[model samples]
Target: SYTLKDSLSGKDFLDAFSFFADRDPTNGFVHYVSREVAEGEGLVKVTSSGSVYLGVDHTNTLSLTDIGRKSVRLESTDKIDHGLVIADIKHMPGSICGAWPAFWTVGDTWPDDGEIDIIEGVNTQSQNTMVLHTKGNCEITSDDDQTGTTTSNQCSLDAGPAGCVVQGTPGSYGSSFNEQGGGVYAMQWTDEFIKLWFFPRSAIPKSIESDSPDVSEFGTPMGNFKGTCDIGKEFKPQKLVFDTTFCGDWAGSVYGQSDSCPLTKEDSLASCIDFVATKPEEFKEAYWEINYLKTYT
Candidate 1:
């Protein structure tokens, strides 16, 4: 299953809450967003110039209120053998600079049920990363292991001029996403292992015209390289996430301190606000323009 959230309301609204209240409810989970704006709703007031003050006080922490199911199950049913979910989401404009946007999936029991972050990053212009959270005895590999064949590194793919993978590059997908317009993220799940693939806006296959399409032919390195990763044993239900957050624990905490991505303490606040203001229209337009989203096995 797959879902997307453009704005925030009630308990499911984690991004807005992190923006206005300056704190993230999902502290223990992956800290996709940063802490700068999370500490005091810095992005909302600064970027929107205080025109929008999404109140977090009224937000709910209900399990399924805003995010729907706290976790989704990926187990095979009588009629189903495996699951393949994909989200072609263009994050709202609020995702620039201090903003944090993510496309991730979580299981019913969190780390236990397993987590798959198909697309996640902070700030603007960085490595677009894919991570899998599992309980125990899980490995990611390409090719059919049962047949004793090998393939390229399961986690390798092209991330643009910067090449495939970089340990700590600012201009990579993870940070540069908001700048170039987020791209397509696909996750293929089975009991053996869960694989994550990402394609930047420029690199996305032209054949797959719609937001959701049969991306199988795009081949390995897209996000499906985990061919024989053991999905049947590692698969689980996971909630899809699409959010634009302000400076929270993740970004804010290291906003000025980190030299890895550019923004420094002296100018992070102003830089964030300026970035947000210029892109409001883009944010509003992107949210309403979602063409379609569908899941297939």
Candidate 2:
């Protein structure tokens, strides 16, 4: 029960989004650049093969006093209230130390309008977490039907940044996800619930290729949000966003706990910033190579 509304690929993909050049609202150690700066610096590109590439600056090593690493954050101009959204991706930022990447959707306002984290993880994370954030009182309440592990039930902003976390299986994010050439992430948002399905490259259902996706063929979802809260009231029309930032709120706060990322200084905070600034080569794999983003209603 879906009809394709938007199909974004190649040049269309680049045209569909507006660059967010402002300081990261999440306090990431990143300098979000304008569209002109992004094109001139090679941070955003569309290949002849009709694929879009969104990458960060990996060539320059920065001084500790520098502002932050240069990167791009693109927000879709279209907004969807409730429907099926699918993203076909070839590659995403690898699980390098101090890197934080996310593909998500949020309304213009903060928690009142709601936020959905479809693909997100911090440094060295092997799995993806799908989360929902609202003003208060919303919750998942159950995970009996999902394939993912529910870490939290409360989706309220007062519940902290953790939100309502449903962690996916291995290969859902980071190195493993990139190694398989990435895949499709389908989000089915309805008034009843918000559900997420992940199809790794080797196993994407054939139905995903069609304009009308058959969810029955897709199998169990990685995340399912349904409960007492009024979904339609809490979640307004949302704009999709793709961003890769370094040592931000989540990644930086948990940097010291990561065994893969280094801790050169006594303070984990200092170490994360230093590593991101000094080791530009490490971020070479930190990019998003997307095939398409399709939405259905």
Candidate 3:
């Protein structure tokens, strides 16, 4: 077991992270602003309530050629392994067209070292989706027990996307998630397996609020990854990441895949990019309000 340690919070939380002021790796339509630029342009802030507010600019007149819609991408300064991460959130980037927000971890070596998507969703998704991406020798058992539904048992790049995924319970994403005052998302990564759990406001354990957690007491996880491949070998040290982008790979490629994507038959990626560029106000709700984030081994 690893001892718990405070990561970041209060007014210093924003400073603790290294702003990823670069292009979106997923090729999303976004302008990841630097720490100075983000703060100068009001893209990130800390409210008096002690909560950290990470949001994108929603009033800019954007175009494919414009400075790209201003957004924020943050990565933790520290890279950790086989630990428990808990983020007490008040609101997330709700389900909306052209919006893709995620809380995940990626190793320095890309897929070879593995990655974990703890909370991820796009385009008005009703529920969250958890996924694990690795390079080789990783396969989750189909019969593996978990609270969530497994979309794929394989976590290798060769098998389709090669990422094992689990769809979250309804109300786990988008507007419904915020309508209830948000909740907590906890991720436990150990040598044996990786598990993700979501707890709505009403269901949060008292221990979490007090800054202490006994992961075993949290019941079944929404997603659990454990089977072939050595977890520690496949998933090494990874940096925590949080970012919001628009009309990119996953959201754009799967434009009409979901009947819920409010788009007509004639619509496509171009339309999503247009909306994301022109209607900035539509993404005003696309922001993250984090009460606190803690880590433990």
> Comparing 2 and 3 by lDDT, which wins?
2
The window of 10 residues in a row where model 1 has the poorest summed lDDT is 68-77
State the displacement of the C-alpha of residue 100, model 1, in Å, after optimal TM-score superposition.
2.3
Q: Which stretches of candidate 1 lie over 4 Å from their true place?
A: 1-23, 28-81, 91-97, 141-182, 199-207, 210-216, 223-232, 257-289
- Candidate 1 lDDT at 157 equals 22
Whole-model Cα lDDT of every candidate shown, in order? 0.39, 0.87, 0.81
Query: Highest TM-score, which number?
Result: 2
Cα error, residue 51 of model 2, in Å, equals 1.0
- Tens-digit lDDT track for model 2 on 1-297? 888999999988888999999888888889999888988999988877788999999999998767789999999999987889999999999988888999999888754556999999888889998989887588786598899999988988876767889999889998899999899999988877888988999788887886679989988888988787864467878999999999877888889784578889767777889999999999999999999999999
- Whole-model lDDT for model 2 versus the true structure? 0.87
Best by lDDT: 2
Question: How far is 275's C-alpha from truth in model 1 (Å)?
Answer: 11
* Rank by TM-score (best first): 2, 3, 1
Q: Per-residue lDDT for 1-297 in model 3, tens only?
A: 447775678666777689888778888888898888877887788888889888898988786555467889889888777778989889999878888899999877655566888889878787888999877767786334687898877888777673888888877887989999889999888777888889998899777776668776788888888889765567768889989988778877676566355454355676667767877888889999998888887
* Model 1 C-alpha lDDT per residue in residues 1-297, reported as the tens digit of each score: 322223222222333222212234433111222334333533222222212222111122322112210111112111212465544444332323444544555444543455555555555434554455444443345433221122223332221111111121233253254456556555556665555555556776664444334546555543332433454555544455444454445544444444333452355544443433333333332121122233565
